[PDB]
Every structure is written in C-alpha cells, then in structure tokens.
Amino acid sequence: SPFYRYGMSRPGSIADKRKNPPWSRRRPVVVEPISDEDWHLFCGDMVEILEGKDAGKQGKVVQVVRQRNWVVLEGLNTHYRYIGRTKDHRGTMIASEAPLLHHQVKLVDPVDRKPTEIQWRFTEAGERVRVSTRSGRIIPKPEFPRADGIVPETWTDGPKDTSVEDALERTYVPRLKTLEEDVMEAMGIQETRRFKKVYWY
Amino acid sequence: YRAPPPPRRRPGPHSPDPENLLTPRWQLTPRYVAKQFGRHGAISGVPPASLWPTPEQLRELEAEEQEWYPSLATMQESLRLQQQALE
Amino acid sequence: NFEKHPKELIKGPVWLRGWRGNELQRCVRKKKFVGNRMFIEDLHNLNKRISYLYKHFNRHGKYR
Amino acid sequence: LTYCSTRKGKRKTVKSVVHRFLRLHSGLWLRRKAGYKKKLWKKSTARKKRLREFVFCSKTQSKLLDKMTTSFWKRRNWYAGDPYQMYHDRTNLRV
Amino acid sequence: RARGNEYQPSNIKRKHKHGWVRRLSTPAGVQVILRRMLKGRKSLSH
Amino acid sequence: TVIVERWWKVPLAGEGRKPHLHRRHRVYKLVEDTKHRPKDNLELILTQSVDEIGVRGDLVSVKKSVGRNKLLSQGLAVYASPENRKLFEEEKSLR
Amino acid sequence: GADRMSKWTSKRGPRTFTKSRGAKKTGIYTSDRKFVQIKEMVPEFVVPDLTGFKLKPYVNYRAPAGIDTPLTAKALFQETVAPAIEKDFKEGTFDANNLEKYGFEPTQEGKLFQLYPKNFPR
Amino acid sequence: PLHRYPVHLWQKLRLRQGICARLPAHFLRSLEEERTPTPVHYKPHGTKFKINPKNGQRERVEDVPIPVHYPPESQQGLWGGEGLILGYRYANNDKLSKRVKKVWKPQLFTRELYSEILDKKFTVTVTMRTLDLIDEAYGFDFYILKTPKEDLGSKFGMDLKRGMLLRLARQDPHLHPENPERRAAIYDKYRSFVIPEAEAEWVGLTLEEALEKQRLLEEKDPVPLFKVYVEELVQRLQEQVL
Amino acid sequence: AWRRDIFGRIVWHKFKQWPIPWYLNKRYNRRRFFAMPYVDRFIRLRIEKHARIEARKRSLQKKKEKILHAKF
RNA sequence: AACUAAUCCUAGCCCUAGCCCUACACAAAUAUAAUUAUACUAUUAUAUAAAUCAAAACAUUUAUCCACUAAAAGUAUUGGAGAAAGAAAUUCGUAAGGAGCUAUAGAACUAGUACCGCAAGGGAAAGAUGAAAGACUAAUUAAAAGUAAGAACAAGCAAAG
Numbered sequence A: 001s002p003f004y005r006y007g008m009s010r011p012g013s014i015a016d017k018r019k020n021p022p023w024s025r026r027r028p029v030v031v032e033p034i035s036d037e038d039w040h041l042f043c044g045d046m047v048e049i050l051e052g053k054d055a056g057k058q059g060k061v062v063q064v065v066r067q068r069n070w071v072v073l074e075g076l077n078t079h080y081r082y083i084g085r086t087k088d089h090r091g092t093m094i095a096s097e098a099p100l101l102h103h104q105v106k107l108v109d110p111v112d113r114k115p116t117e118i119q120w121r122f123t124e125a126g127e128r129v130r131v132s133t134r135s136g137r138i139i140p141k142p143e144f145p146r147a148d149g150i151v152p153e154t155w156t157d158g159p160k161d162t163s164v165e166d167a168l169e170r171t172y173v174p175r176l177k178t179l180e181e182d183v184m185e186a187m188g189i190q191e192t193r194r195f196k197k198v199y200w201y
Numbered sequence B: 001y002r003a004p005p006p007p008r009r010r011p012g013p014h015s016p017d018p019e020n021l022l023t024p025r026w027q028l029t030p031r032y033v034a035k036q037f038g039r040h041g042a043i044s045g046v047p048p049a050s051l052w053p054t055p056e057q058l059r060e061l062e063a064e065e066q067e068w069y070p071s072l073a074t075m076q077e078s079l080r081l082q083q084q085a086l087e
Numbered sequence C: 001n002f003e004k005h006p007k008e009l010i011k012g013p014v015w016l017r018g019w020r021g022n023e024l025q026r027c028v029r030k031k032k033f034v035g036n037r038m039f040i041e042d043l044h045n046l047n048k049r050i051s052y053l054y055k056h057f058n059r060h061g062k063y064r
Numbered sequence D: 001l002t003y004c005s006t007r008k009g010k011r012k013t014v015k016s017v018v019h020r021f022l023r024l025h026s027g028l029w030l031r032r033k034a035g036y037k038k039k040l041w042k043k044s045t046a047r048k049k050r051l052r053e054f055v056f057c058s059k060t061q062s063k064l065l066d067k068m069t070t071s072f073w074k075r076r077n078w079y080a081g082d083p084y085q086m087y088h089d090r091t092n093l094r095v
Numbered sequence E: 001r002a003r004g005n006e007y008q009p010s011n012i013k014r015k016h017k018h019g020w021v022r023r024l025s026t027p028a029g030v031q032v033i034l035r036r037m038l039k040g041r042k043s044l045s046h
Numbered sequence F: 001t002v003i004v005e006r007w008w009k010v011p012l013a014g015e016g017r018k019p020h021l022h023r024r025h026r027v028y029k030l031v032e033d034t035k036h037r038p039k040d041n042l043e044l045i046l047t048q049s050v051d052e053i054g055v056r057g058d059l060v061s062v063k064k065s066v067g068r069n070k071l072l073s074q075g076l077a078v079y080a081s082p083e084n085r086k087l088f089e090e091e092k093s094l095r
Numbered sequence G: 001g002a003d004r005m006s007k008w009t010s011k012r013g014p015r016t017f018t019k020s021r022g023a024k025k026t027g028i029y030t031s032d033r034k035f036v037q038i039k040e041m042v043p044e045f046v047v048p049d050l051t052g053f054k055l056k057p058y059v060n061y062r063a064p065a066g067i068d069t070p071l072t073a074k075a076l077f078q079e080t081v082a083p084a085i086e087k088d089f090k091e092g093t094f095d096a097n098n099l100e101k102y103g104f105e106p107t108q109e110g111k112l113f114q115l116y117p118k119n120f121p122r
Numbered sequence H: 001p002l003h004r005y006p007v008h009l010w011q012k013l014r015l016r017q018g019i020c021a022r023l024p025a026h027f028l029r030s031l032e033e034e035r036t037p038t039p040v041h042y043k044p045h046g047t048k049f050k051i052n053p054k055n056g057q058r059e060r061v062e063d064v065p066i067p068v069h070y071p072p073e074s075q076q077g078l079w080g081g082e083g084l085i086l087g088y089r090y091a092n093n094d095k096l097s098k099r100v101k102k103v104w105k106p107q108l109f110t111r112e113l114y115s116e117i118l119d120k121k122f123t124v125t126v127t128m129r130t131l132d133l134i135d136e137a138y139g140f141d142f143y144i145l146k147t148p149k150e151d152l153g154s155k156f157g158m159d160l161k162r163g164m165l166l167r168l169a170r171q172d173p174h175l176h177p178e179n180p181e182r183r184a185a186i187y188d189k190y191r192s193f194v195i196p197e198a199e200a201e202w203v204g205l206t207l208e209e210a211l212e213k214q215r216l217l218e219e220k221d222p223v224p225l226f227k228v229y230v231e232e233l234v235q236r237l238q239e240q241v242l
Numbered sequence I: 001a002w003r004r005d006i007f008g009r010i011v012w013h014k015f016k017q018w019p020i021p022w023y024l025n026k027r028y029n030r031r032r033f034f035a036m037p038y039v040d041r042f043i044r045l046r047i048e049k050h051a052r053i054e055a056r057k058r059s060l061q062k063k064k065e066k067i068l069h070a071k072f
Numbered sequence J: 001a002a003c004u005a006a007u008c009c010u011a012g013c014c015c016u017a018g019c020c021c022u023a024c025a026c027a028a029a030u031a032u033a034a035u036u037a038u039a040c041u042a043u044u045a046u047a048u049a050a051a052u053c054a055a056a057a058c059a060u061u062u063a064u065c066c067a068c069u070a071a072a073a074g075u076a077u078u079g080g081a082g083a084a085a086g087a088a089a090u091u092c093g094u095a096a097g098g099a100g101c102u103a104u105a106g107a108a109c110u111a112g113u114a115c116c117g118c119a120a121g122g123g124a125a126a127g128a129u130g131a132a133a134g135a136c137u138a139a140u141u142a143a144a145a146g147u148a149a150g151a152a153c154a155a156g157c158a159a160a161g
C-alpha cells in the first residue's frame, strides 16, 4: 500500500498490525534507493559505528531491514526500556538496540580491526565476492542462523519426514506418456470406449 | 561554467523523407524544391533542367497567356474602333 | 550576422513561441496549431471557452 | 462592432460606413445630403441646390466613424489624377 | 392518501426493466452501459 | 437528375485545401431537372432485319425507349459503336 | 431500494428463480419431470495403493535442493526421441514416414487422453 | 496531453500496421486513392476564371461538391452515381421567406440487363442516368469495366467488375461452353480490360472482406515441434557425416 | 480465439464443448462479437483516459527523483 | 494555572515539452433474470443536429460549435447591404521544464466508493509523533467564536469627556 511504514518489528506480528492500521496515512519515509548489487551489508558482519552515541565501537549485525536501509547491531546504539510490564509488576529493565543507517557504519577488514571500504567483484570461479577498496582482500560471507531458527545439521529425522537419501532418489523415466496414461497402465485400468466428437466453439 | 556551443541553423540543402506522415506537406511540393537550388546552388542536387517548365507545363502557361493577355496590335485595334464608335 | 532571431531560443508551447496575445486570441491560436491532435473533452472545453470569450469581448464591457 | 474577431483576433470595419462616407487623410469626413434623390418634383430649386453638395462631419460624427473603420481606411493613397488630391491637407489653419 | 411507498419490490420486475439482458437489447441501452463503463461504476446494471 | 445550386457563396479554399461548409451552405435552389429535358435519339445498326424500320445492315435512329427494351436486348439490333459500324460497313461494301 | 452490489444467487428471488452454485451436472432430466442419473457423468476418483510408500508430506532440512530447471520441449525430445533417431541414423534405418515408430502421434483423435483439446480433467 | 498524429491521419496508420499492412500493395492504394466522383447533381465551372459582373475583375472560381446521401439500399442496385440530396429550400425562392426542409429523390426504375461476359441476366434497380451511361458506353459490360470505383457508387456493381475481370483474366471455358467460337468473340471484344489474375481478385473488396481473405490465406495449424526438432537433428547429423 | 465484444474491446474468448455445430446453435447466435459505429466514440475516449493516467504517473515519478536528489 | 480547539507537510494534482500504438492479464465462470459447464426462441448504428443566444422584439440571418504558421487583410466579397460574416491569388518557414497548487487549494477522487434515485443519473467528507513505539504516541499555543475560572445590584445603541 502507498501508506505503509516499515518498522523494527518483523512484519505481520502483533506489533506491526498495531502500528500500521488500514487507515494509517503517516508521512512517507524517503529512503535513498540502493540497488541489490550495491548493498553490501549482511547479517553477522562485524561493523564499526562511524557516528552516534557509540561511535567507534564495533558490533555484529543481527538484523537488516532493507526497506528502511537499516542495520541493527547487537549491544550498541542501545537505549533502555521495560519489558514484561504488568499492572502488578513494573517488569524487567532491558537495553534495546536502535536501528542504524548504512552510511553511519562500515564493514571491518577480516584480518585487521579497521573500517575498510569494500567493492563487489567476481572471482576465478565466477562467484561474486566483496573486495576491500584498500588492501584488497576477500571478506567471506558470515554464516548466521536462519530466521526460522531451524538448524539443518542437528535436525533429526522424525515421522512425516523423508530421509535425505530417499529424497535424492531419482526414478523419473522420460517418456511421451502423460500422468493420466502412466497411472492406468501401472494400476491396470482398462477402458475401450472413446469420447464422441465435440464441437468446440 | 562553460556555456554550451552557440545555437546554429543547420547548413546545406535539406531534403525530408516523403515516407514520414508528419513531415509538413509544403516541404514536399515542387516549389520547395526550387528554393533548395537557389539557396545552395548546385549542391542542392535539383536537376537543373527541371527548373524550367515542362512541355505540358509550358502549354499551360502559353494557353493562359493568350486567353487573358492579348497582343499589342489587338489592344490598339480595339481602341481605334471604340473611339470611332464614340466619335 | 542575424542567422537566428532570439525568439527562436524560447522553450514553450508550440502555439506561443515568440508570440503574445490576449486569452481569446490565445484560445484560437492553441486550436490552430494542435486543434487536430487534442483530446475530445479538452477540445470541447476549448470550444466553449472561445464562445464565452467571444461574447464577453465583443458584446460586454464598460466601453463601446 | 467586432472588437476581437475569432479567426484573426482583430477589429472589423463596418461596411455601412465605407459605402457612405469618404475620409480625407487630415481627419475630415465627407457625406451626401439625405433625400437628395427623393421627391425632387416638390422641392424648391434652392432646396435642391443645397442637397447636391458634399458636406463635412462634426467632431463627434468624425470620432464615431474613426471607431467604426480600421487603420487601412486611414492611410495615404497616391492615386494619379485624384480629384481629391488638394483636399487631403489643411493649410493656413491656426487652432 | 399517504405517499412515499411507490417502490413495491419485485425481482422479476426489477431484472426485466433494468437488467443486463434488457440493457443490451437496444443500442440506446448498450450506450447506457458504455458510459457507465467509462465512469468506473461498480455495478453497470441490475 | 436533380441539379442544385446553393444560395450562399462559399469562400475560396486554395489549392491543397477543402472548402469547409456551414449550415447556410445547405440551402439549395433547383437549377434544372434533367428528366424533363427533351430527349436525344438512339443510333443502332440492325444485326437482324427489323420489322418495318429497315432491313439488316442499315443504321437507324429510334426514340430511346423502343431501342433499349427490344432492339438492343433481343438481339435484333446492335449498338452503332465505332467498331460495330466499321464491321457492318465491310459487309455493306462487299455487296 | 434493491441492493445492486450483492451477488445474484439462488437464495434470492422468487421460488421459480433457481441456479447452481457451480456443481457439475451428473444426469439428465427426461420428459414427465423425471431425473435419470448417468453413471459415466459421475466422476470416479482413481486412488493408488499407498502400501510401501517411502514419501511423506515433509522433507528433511539436511537434504539439499537442486537447481530449478523448468522442463522444456527440447529437453524432453533430446532425452527420449533423439537417442533413438541418432542410433537409427548411423544404422540408416530412418525415414520421414515412420516418425510414429519413435512415438509421434499424427493426430490426437483416437487417444483416450487427448493432448489438445484436452478431454480429461486434472 | 496531445496525440502524436492528427486524428485524420489515424486511418492511414491503421492500414500501415498489422495484418492490414500485409495486404497486397495494389489493394491498399485502391482505398486511399479516393477520387471525387464525377459531378451529377451540380454543374461544374467550365473555366477556372470568371469576370464578376459587379466589379468586372477576374476572379478565381472553384467547384464545391453537393453533399449527397447514399442509402444502403443503393449498394444493391446500379444508380449512375445518383443519391439523395438532403437540403433546405426557401419558400417561393426568396431568401426573405421561411427555410423549409426538402429532400430530392431519384426516380428509381427496375429493369433487366444482360451481361455478355457473365452470360446471365440480372434484375437491378437502375436510374435513367445509368441507362444513358450504359448506352454511351456501348454495352452493359463496357459500362461496368470502364467506370471507376467511385463513379460507379455501388458495391453490387463492384462485384460485377470483379466477376467480369476474373472471367476475362482466366479465360474461363465456362463462358458459353461447347461453343468455343462464341466464347472467343466475347473475350477478344473485351481484351483491352484484361489484367493479371492476382490483381483482379482484389477488386471491389472492402477492408473487412480483404482482411478476411488475407486471414484465410495465412491460416495454418501450428507445426508439431516433434517434426521441427527432427529436421534440425537430421540436418546436424547429415552435416556431421558429410 | 481473439475476438471483439460489442463494447469495443479485444477479449480472449475461451471455447466451450457443444453437441452441435456453431451455425446450428441458437444460443451462440445471440452472443455478439462485433461492434456498431456508435462504439467508435467510446473507443477513442478510453485511449485518452489511459493516456491521461499514463502521463500523470510519468510526471509523478519525475518529482520523486527530484526529492531524492534534493535529499541526497 | 483550561475545556472546546489551533499549529503542521506530503499524499497527489496542473500546464507544457518529448512521444502514435504493439498493459489484450493464471485456472474457472458470464449475453440465460450477465458472471449458472451442453442443443429449445437464433444475431445488425444513422436520413440534413436542433435550439438557446445576438439583431436591445422577431420572421432572412447570427463567429466557434461544424485542414499548415506569418503576410496580403479585416482587403475583395457576402448581408432584413442591419447585426454581422469573410476569402483567395501570391509571398515566408530545417524546430525535460515551472516568478504552477499544497488538504475549503490542485482532479470529483483516500472514491466514481459510501450515500441518494425504480432507472438514466447525481455525488461527497477526511490525513498529520520520533532516528527508534522491539523507545507505555509525541508536541506546540495570554492565541477564534463557545464556555469555565468569576450570576446580578436605580438610569437606558451601552460608549465618550
């Protein structure tokens, strides 16, 4: 919709329905459009705060709202709020991180702790990789847990789950027969009648 | 800043493409063709013989001249008769 | 050397580059240049605008 | 009067004036005497003599006709042999 | 008497009088549909 | 035919232009109705001996109506065209 | 005062007005107002035997998905018919008339499942 | 906004785009090349100049065609360009009287005409003007072939033109069968109007009929890809063996 | 088949299964796939209505670029 | 020492310039009482635009409405020769922006929706926190009329000296 503001809560949660009612007509946010190729910030990448309350402190990206050009760092640019407040109890005070725009942070050289600018460039194999503008070097994509939280390697086979080998098994035989014709032959159904002529129009 | 190069009228003869339907019609008449010759002379490419009227065109001009513009003798002859009638 | 008249440097509507006139004249001039390339509703409004102005400038006003 | 014509956007001459009055370049207007061809059999000889003459117009009438005619009818015309050649100018008038 | 109740609803009467098939019967009715499509109406007829 | 002339003159249009008309240019007067005009005659050469109007090979003139209905169509006579007269004149010569 | 915006359905209108909700017809109405169902017009669900089936609704996360390659007519032809023609071409036992030998169907008429126009539902 | 082209040029662009363009060149020229029909209901100016009586000066004169309404019924007859003159008249022929609506109608007649090339007799609604034109053309068949599309002013006549032209173009033996001598005479008599067979077919057809004719000619069922791949495979294998 | 309705639009017509040919079916010969001349005026208006809408959108995008360049 | 309220900036819009078009939207359904899977009864625009209005009425008539720029020219002509209308011949020509609008403005438009009429059809109103609401939604203002805080006290266009 033309009037929809992206915030910090993951879309579709109770918070995002409360913030953005259908009748909301808040002033649009103006965001410098950034090409998919241009963007170089990914979850798990260590970055340094160029300016702000925690300027000069390095942190780890834990969330990226590309709709707002936001990068959220753990334990930095952090203000305070009460979580779990109830009528009976005040709640628990916690420190909540605030979003940072990309230009307010920079990526870090993998070997040395410095805010080295990077450029996108291909490799011998052809895979796209970020390369530092100075001290040209390959910064690997940081492995991060998936948002759904499912861990592949530790996942254990259970009922209603196919085995890995069974899924990999291939039995398709290329043949000029439809599914409607393979099933009957396999299942042994026999039909000798044929449909009468139909005048399509 | 440096200003753009000064505006200039396009030089040399100009021939539009007759195919284009938006090209102005007056820019395609034979009269417009002669203008090209006068402005740029030979470089226009107009066949110089075409400038003069064609034999069928020549008959058109000659036919009109006799109809409306009489000879010197005829004018004098008629004037004498009119004076005689008035006299 | 008078190659180009300065009026030729004006950027604007085709029907009023290097020209000025009152609204009735402006209305008729817009029709002449782009009368055949105008939308039906726009052309209808222009025709009515001309007829209103004609009766005003030619039949009304303080001075005769 | 058409102060602004649709096709051209100009003032239009009234042709009822062009067919009745003559303008001399100075600004005078000439006219005939109404009825100079009517019922001549009952008019006196002196009466008829007055009618045959060409008469001038007043300042108001001249001002009116200048509003009903366009500048083309107020120009200089160099006609050879014009019988109104001498009358287009005012001479020895102090005013 | 007391006016105001002229509308005596009947679905057969309604659909015959201002229905889709009724409108398309005549070109004058089809031009009623054509204008309504131009304006953007939710319902072109009954 | 009905031949009509307008009552109101149409301003000249030019060379590559069309004379845009107006509602006053649709008032007509009757120039002439061609049907009432005196009729010509039809010249046709007989291809077969006609009844009481000549023998075959003789050019004849008929009152329009007679020729069209019977002589022209029933094959008794043929059009007196240039080629038709030429051909028949050859038969006439070779006698 | 009639609601123009609500959908026209059989619940509305007088008793005489009726229409379907989209249910496919399965019979014929004969004379004297008698319904005669036709067995052939009644769909029959061909259900397979699932004994010994090794596939379940969900798949293991560990299993790696492959590259998506939408099947194309050329790809199927190369897999199925090209090898037969290629081998036959070397042997020289190939002619234009007998394309049906490799599986070509000159016309879909006579097929139980016509490819076009389709005479079989999903 | 503004359209890129003037409205009156839209028709030309319509002919220039799509299947319309693919129509044969000669047919397309026929539609646009509309020549003003020969005067019927007005007397054209003999000269291009006249002497105005009032001022006695040479003034240009032009011929303004009278608008005539052609009812669709005329398309099924043979009127010699005639039509309905829908206009106004001044009562008593003075412009100071009332303006009264007037419609002038042609004295239609129904007659029977025989076409030599077709060897068939047609019954057609025909005006006395057409009868004179046929006589001046020395035959019904000559009249149809000579008269251009516009002057003819009839769709029925144009069909006759195509039929006669196609008959002559193909030298069809169906004309007077078992009498070759008779057939040759007719063809020779009208030999001047012979034109190529392909061109004759596209004579008198309207844009829709021409569009339908083209669509039918170009209609083809899609080629099975099976065959297409086979042709490519065979060519590649044959070239490799070469 | 691609066909035109009576409202002067090009519409893709899906065919149906019938037990008789089209020329013998009296329900098919009530459907109309042609337009009379009176639809000519409305055809042009849709062209202009869409042309107006398209023009406004292009202008709007131009402004949004101006705001972005002013911002950055 | 405040209630009612007020403040606000971008949603879109406007006029040009450039540019013919090739935005014709899975599957299913719809001309039957549209959006109902199959046979019945089959399917097809229009003869001349009028009038208002002007002529201080009205009756002939009345620019636009109903074919390139500039010049010839408001000229020749036309006209109850009144109001008014109005040529041509012939010359001349290579053709993305805003001293626009900013929520009673700009489009009617957040929408041809709600609502109103049997129908054709007519037709709205409004929104406003911050970098972050995964920081308990901000601010900002003796500020409109209206009230309250605080009813009134012989005598009068309510004020002026």
Ligand SMILES: [Mg+2]
Pocket (backbone or CB within 6 Å): E004, E006
């Ligand atoms: Mg009521």
Ligand SMILES: [Mg+2]
Pocket (backbone or CB within 6 Å): E008
């Ligand atoms: Mg009742």
Ligand SMILES: [Mg+2]
Pocket (backbone or CB within 6 Å): F014
């Ligand atoms: Mg000219």
Ligand SMILES: [Mg+2]
Pocket (backbone or CB within 6 Å): none
């Ligand atoms: Mg009248």
Ligand SMILES: [Mg+2]
Pocket (backbone or CB within 6 Å): J054, J055
């Ligand atoms: Mg009046």
Ligand SMILES: [Mg+2]
Pocket (backbone or CB within 6 Å): none
């Ligand atoms: Mg009165």
Ligand SMILES: [Mg+2]
Pocket (backbone or CB within 6 Å): none
């Ligand atoms: Mg508004």
Ligand SMILES: [Mg+2]
Pocket (backbone or CB within 6 Å): J108
């Ligand atoms: Mg509004």
Ligand SMILES: [Mg+2]
Pocket (backbone or CB within 6 Å): none
């Ligand atoms: Mg107050």
Ligand SMILES: [Mg+2]
Pocket (backbone or CB within 6 Å): none
């Ligand atoms: Mg007092």
